[PDB]
Design goal:
The PDB classes it as oxidoreductase. The protein is α/β, with parallel strands linked by helices and about 575 residues long. Helix content is about 30%, strand content about 15%. The structure holds flavin-adenine dinucleotide, protoporphyrin IX containing FE (4 copies), fumaric acid and sodium ion.
């Protein structure tokens, strides 16, 4: 057979997959996926039959209920979603090579005939609020608006939920929480505000940073009430004390937070629509929001009538062409991001009259795996790892800010460096076992053996770790002035991970006020239009602190949903 449908129709009728009249159920293909499951079992049941030692197409870190049609199309060849970040040895029937080629908002202007036809028709739905994007900010706004009495529709352009938020690792910043107190940590909202402004080179909007610090404990409390585990509290770069909250034992914060938000949306029967892209905010004769034009992958163009639209579409760090025009020093770099993080939401905002700010400030993460091409968490360093060069020496304070850390690594022989750690560090942060499973953390029972394996001077490496351990014992790093020295590297075996910088987070974006209301270039509010999360500018100034994005998306998402409900 040339395709999956052709295979099935050898022994099955059309209505084995389809509704009675043949029409597709909706853009999520709810009915059609139900039929796959009726014969093959759930995703978990299928996974029992496709196990490899270290990977499984049908059992991954993705949260929510991943639809079969995300990867298996019926009437044409289709792509394995995992191929957008990894290169596992797969043999999916009727596969083709991964390629993402999504038209820009401007390119879609050529659908004049089809768009005018849609706008001339009745609205397909009439509701209170539409939320655009199923990351942390979007789920938070949808839940908070619903709890405030509003009827919501939540849309996602990708086949899967979660955006970049489902990938988050190191933690969510807050002060001064019950969780911190239980771990004998002393902190304050004031100290979090001070650290944040200093980190951003004092470019941040202070009114927006005040919302970030003052609402941070409430946001940890809100997630915890909904079922989240945020009880482990670690250190990240630029923080005066430990304040990065994550699950027990040091597991990833992102996939967990998104799973909790998804379960809470399902509990409330929130209308969530996959493969549905927001195209154009609609405004009335007086310039207030009246609805939104969307494009369903399967059902085509239609519009929704609503009082308010909340843009929660994330950043543009995957789009290297756009990145390079704003910061040429990042041209040609790899990125940490999901394949859809290209900035189309910003285009939607500008077309509706919203102004942008701080767009020139773009963050590289200092430690992506050279071998696997994925983010390796800053929490590996926070919990005690060091960095060495090919000469086997330390060369930087491992918990300095991200710009200086990236510059330092690129200045070393080969434009990369190695994370070095032991079994005490490994046991303190369960996320590390994920890098070991991926095959990117080679190991040996001595540093001489490990250096020989990886091309690091073995004698120098050995002396480097002995010296560092002496500095830990004495309590002061006289070599690089690292201010936090949590563990000696001296238990069990040793590990190395080769690392290099990659494009990560876009600090700029749409201009909002403290009520998450979008403003134009004259600083006038556009009535009914809101923005929340990485799509916004002004919160993080010239440089974002590790842990501050997950804090931002829950706080600003929740407040946007409440304000939109009140407005409606
Ligand atoms: C690997 C990785 C690890 C990270 N770890 C951390 C961490 O530990 N701590 C931390 O604080 N930050 C971390 N960050 C940063 C943080 O996760 C992101 O800033 C966060 O994902 C921003 O959330 P969001 O809701 O604004 O956007 P996202 O989570 O990116 O969600 C936006 C969604 O909207 C969509 N969308 C876009 N345009 C449209 C459209 N036109 N119509 C419909 N849908 C649209 C999507 O495709 C995407 O699903 C990490 C980022 C990465 C990439
Ligand atoms: C729904 C759209 C759906 C999908 C997706 C799906 C997957 C799938 C694959 C990938 C194969 C392997 C094909 C090959 O070897 O070339 C396969 C094969 C079988 N299927 Fe299926 N399947 C979907 C839907 C359905 C439904 C609705 C039925 C039954 C009415 C069904 C059953 C079968 C059977 C039988 C096979 C042959 C292998 C076997 O398990 O005996 N599937 N399917
Ligand atoms: C949804 C629940 C779903 C079903 C059903 C399904 C079916 C399916 C079959 C029957 C096979 C062949 C199994 C066999 O050889 O006996 C198969 C194989 C692969 N699939 Fe699948 N699949 C479902 C969902 C998904 C999704 C969401 C993805 C991508 C994230 C995906 C991809 C793959 C891949 C890759 C394979 C080959 C596996 C391997 O080589 O190890 N499927 N699927
Ligand atoms: C039986 C021979 C059969 C027919 C006929 C048929 C038709 C059909 C059409 C016309 C579409 C497109 C509809 C639109 O664009 O509005 C479509 C799309 C999908 N189908 Fe189908 N289809 C037949 C058989 C089957 C079988 C056996 C399956 C499942 C294994 C199946 C499923 C799907 C799915 C999923 C889609 C969405 C697009 C895609 O994945 O290709 N159909 N079909
Ligand atoms: C697609 C559904 C998919 C699968 C399957 C998959 C697997 C996978 C494995 C086996 C690992 C090693 C650790 C583990 O066993 O969980 C791993 C690690 C990371 N991945 Fe992944 N992955 C899939 C898809 C994607 C995509 C599309 C991205 C990027 C947008 C991505 C990212 C990452 C990252 C980062 C890691 C590092 C470990 C961690 O952060 O947990 N994956 N993945
Ligand atoms: O865990 C990390 O390294 C990333 C943190 C962040 O971007 O905030
Ligand atoms: Na931003």
């Amino acid at each position: 057979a040339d395709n999956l449908a052709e295979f099935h129709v050898q022994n099955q009728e059309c209505d084995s997959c389809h509704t009675p009249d043949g029409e597709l159920s909706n853009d999520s293909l709810t009915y059609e996926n139900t039929q796959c499951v009726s014969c093959h079992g759930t995703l978990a049941e299928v996974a029992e039959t496709t196990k490899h030692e270290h990977y499984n197409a049908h059992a991954s870190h993705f949260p929510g209920e991943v639809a079969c049609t995300s990867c298996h199309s019926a009437h044409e060849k289709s792509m394995v979603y995992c191929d957008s970040c990894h290169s596992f040895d797969f043999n999916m029937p009727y596969a083709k090579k991964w390629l993402r080629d999504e038209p820009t908002i401007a390119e879609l202007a050529k659908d004049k005939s089809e768009r005018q036809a849609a706008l001339a028709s009745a609205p397909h739905d009439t509701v209170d609020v539409v939320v655009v994007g199923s990351g942390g900010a979007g789920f938070s706004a949808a839940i908070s608006a619903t709890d405030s009495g509003a009827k919501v529709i939540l849309i996602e352009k990708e086949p899967v939920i979660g955006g970049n938020a489902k990938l988050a690792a190191g933690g969510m910043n807050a002060a001064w929480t019950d969780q911190q107190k239980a771990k004998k940590i002393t902190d304050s909202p004031e100290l979090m505000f001070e650290d944040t402004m200093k980190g951003g080179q004092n470019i941040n909007d202070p009114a927006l940073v005040k919302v970030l610090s003052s609402h941070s404990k409430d946001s940890v409390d809100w997630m915890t009430a909904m079922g989240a585990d945020l009880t482990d509290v670690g250190m990240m770069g630029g923080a005066s004390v430990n304040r990065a909250h994550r699950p027990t034992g040091g597991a990833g914060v992102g996939a967990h937070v998104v799973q909790v938000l998804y379960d809470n949306a399902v509990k409330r029967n929130i209308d969530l629509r996959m493969n549905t892209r927001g195209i154009e905010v609609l405004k009335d004769d007086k310039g207030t929001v009246k609805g939104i034009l969307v494009k369903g992958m399967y059902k085509g163009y239609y519009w929704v009538k609503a009082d308010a639209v909340i843009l929660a579409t994330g950043g543009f760090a995957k789009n290297n062409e756009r990145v390079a025009k704003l910061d040429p020093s990042l041209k040609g770099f790899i990125s940490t991001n999901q394949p859809g993080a290209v900035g189309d939401g910003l285009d939607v905002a500008e077309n509706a009259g919203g102004a942008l700010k701080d767009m020139q400030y773009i963050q590289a993460h200092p430690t992506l795996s050279v071998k696997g091409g994925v983010m390796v968490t800053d929490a590996v360093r926070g919990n005690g790892a060091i960095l060495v060069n090919r000469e086997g020496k330390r060369f930087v304070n491992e918990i300095t800010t991200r710009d200086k850390a990236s510059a330092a690594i690129l200045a070393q022989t080969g434009k990369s460096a190695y994370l070095i750690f032991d079994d005490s560090v490994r046991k303190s942060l369960s996320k590390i076992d994920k890098y070991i499973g991926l095959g990117v953390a080679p190991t040996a029972d001595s540093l001489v053996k490990l250096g020989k394996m990886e091309g690091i001077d073995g004698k120098a490496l050995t002396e480097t770790v002995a010296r560092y351990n002496s500095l830990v014992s004495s309590g002061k790093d006289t070599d690089f002035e690292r201010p936090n020295l949590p563990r000696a590297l001296n238990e069990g075996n040793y590990y190395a991970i080769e690392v290099t910088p990659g494009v990560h987070h876009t600090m700029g974006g749409v201009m909002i006020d403290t009520k998450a209301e979008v403003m134009n270039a004259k600083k006038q509010v556009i009535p009914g239009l809101y923005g929340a999360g990485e799509v916004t500018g002004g919160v993080h100034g010239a440089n974002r602190l590790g842990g501050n994005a997950i804090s931002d998306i829950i706080t600003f998402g929740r407040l946007a949903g409440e304000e939109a409900a009140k407005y409606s």
